[PDB]
Design a protein around this ligand. Structure first.
Ligand SMILES: CNCc1ccc2c(c1)N(C(=O)OCC(F)(F)F)[C@H](CNC(=N)N)[C@H]2NC(=O)C(=O)Nc1ccc(Cl)c(F)c1
Ligand SMILES: *[C@@H]1O[C@H](CO)[C@@H](O)[C@H](O)[C@H]1NC(C)=O
Ligand SMILES: *[C@@H]1O[C@H](CO)[C@@H](O)[C@H](O)[C@H]1NC(C)=O
Ligand SMILES: *[C@@H]1O[C@H](CO)[C@@H](O)[C@H](O)[C@H]1NC(C)=O
Ligand SMILES: *[C@@H]1O[C@H](CO)[C@@H](O)[C@H](O)[C@H]1NC(C)=O
Ligand SMILES: *[C@@H]1O[C@H](CO)[C@@H](O)[C@H](O)[C@H]1NC(C)=O
Ligand SMILES: *[C@@H]1O[C@H](CO)[C@@H](O)[C@H](O)[C@H]1NC(C)=O
Length: 335
């Protein structure tokens, strides 16, 4: 309804680029926020029509533009060239704050699906701290659901609408390019993944009850969305998930169909230099990988899914506003 500002705990002495940007663009966090509960009030939220998402999206576009400059940017006809130094890159949390005369309403119902009325409501100065993690298929390093796994969608009947799965237990994913210089891999504990897809299938079954629930790899599209793509220490990883989204949940039981060994699923990855941009329609070209071992140890805290008797779910993504939504869903700005 207005323009928010961000608070961060960044340093102006970190060269890490989220820190540099936040030093320029955000104010320091207030060391003890105020919060004002109101369990009588009951108000309506719609995480899918939320202007905080747009404001944050603009911020992260600006952050990536100041911080991850490509050597070449191709948008439409024009090509833009510039210095593309390697940088230290590691997302830091950002708080979104309502300005004077304006408050942020937080919904505190632990099972709120992002939409409709919510009974127990607070007012706050700022949101919690959100790391702005750009990725497809898997949401990484977010905050977990507190009770059960929540299925969020603007419209579950409309299979073209992205489904956000909010996990209550994170699943570790470790990706490294070890000391081909483009080739890398990720490890996931098959048991932990197994378990979580068991319970995701449970919740999806509540919403599609006659149906067998299948998980299958992303059909087609650009590589950014047919793989799990993300940025790790400045490098762009593209990790094949066909051994990950590969399983059936039949009669209250999940069976993993993807290949593992020693009880870990291993994703084959490539580090790429030509990137289809999430910010706009265009391509970006970066320098070859920095040298040595490149490793990110992340928590999977959510999934992005697309639905095609049987219901089939494939990993999705590509619109980074859904990544922000998955964190801003409980917040509305008012007054
Ligand atoms: C969810 N609906 C379907 C869909 C599918 C695919 C895309 C959109 C939408 N897109 C959009 O909605 O962009 C928002 C805009 F439209 F406002 F620009 C994008 C358009 N961009 C290009 N065709 N170049 C494209 N996504 C990426 O390319 C994309 O995620 N790349 C990438 C790059 C680096 C990293 Cl680490 C990464 F993790 C991801
Ligand atoms: C979310 O809850 C509302 C009621 O508050 C319901 O109308 C809607 O269908 C639900 N959506 C999902 C994805 O469960
Ligand atoms: C997470 O949610 C699932 C399904 O909604 C539930 O069965 C499970 O008990 C929950 N686990 C934890 C650790 O809260
Ligand atoms: C969402 O689903 C379908 C679209 O196929 C349509 O009936 C309507 O837009 C929505 N329905 C509900 C119940 O919200
Ligand atoms: C992922 O790997 C499988 C088998 O190795 C292959 O068939 C598939 O085309 C790969 N997907 C992508 C997007 O590279
Ligand atoms: C599941 O994995 C196996 C090998 O790990 C592969 O042959 C199969 O095609 C995958 N499933 C789908 C639906 O792609
Ligand atoms: C997730 O957080 C950990 C700890 O801060 C970090 O090392 C890791 O690189 C992060 N992953 C991504 C993809 O940002």
């Amino acid at each position: 309804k207005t323009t928010l500002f961000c608070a961060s705990d960044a340093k102006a002495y970190e060269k890490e680029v989220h820190n540099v940007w936040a030093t320029h663009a955000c104010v320091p966090t207030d060391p003890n926020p105020q919060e004002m509960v109101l369990a009588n009030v009951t108000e309506n939220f719609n995480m899918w029509k939320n202007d905080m998402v747009e404001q944050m999206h603009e911020d992260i576009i600006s952050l990536w533009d100041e911080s991850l400059k490509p050597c070449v940017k191709l948008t439409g006809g024009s090509a833009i060239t510039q210095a593309c130094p390697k940088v230290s890159f590691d997302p830091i949390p950002l708080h979104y704050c309502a300005p004077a005369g304006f408050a942020i309403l937080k919904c505190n119902n632990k099972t709120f699906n992002g939409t409709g009325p919510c009974r127990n409501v607070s007012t706050v100065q700022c949101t919690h701290g959100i790391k702005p993690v750009v990725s497809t298929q898997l949401l990484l390093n977010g905050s977990l659901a507190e009770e059960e796994i929540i299925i969020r969608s603007e419209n579950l009947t409309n299979n073209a609408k992205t489904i956000i799965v909010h996990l209550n237990e994170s699943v570790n994913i470790v990706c490294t390019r070890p000391n081909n210089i483009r080739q890398a891999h990720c490890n996931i504990n098959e048991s932990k993944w197994n378990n979580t897809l068991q319970k995701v299938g449970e919740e999806l079954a509540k919403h599609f009850p006659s149906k067998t629930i299948k998980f299958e790899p992303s059909s087609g599209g650009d590589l950014e969305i047919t793989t799990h793509s993300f940025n790790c220490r400045g490098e762009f990883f593209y990790c094949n998930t066909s051994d990950l989204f590969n399983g059936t949940y039949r009669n209250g039981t999940y069976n993993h169909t993807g290949r593992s060994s020693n009880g870990t699923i291993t994703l084959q990855c490539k580090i790429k230099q030509i990137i289809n941009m999430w910010q706009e329609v265009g391509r970006a070209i970066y320098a070859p990988p920095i040298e040595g071992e490149i490793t990110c140890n992340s928590n999977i805290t959510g999934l992005l899914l697309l639905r095609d008797d049987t219901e089939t779910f494939r990993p999705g993504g590509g619109d980074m506003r859904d990544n922000w939504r998955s964190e801003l869903y409980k917040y509305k700005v008012v007054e």
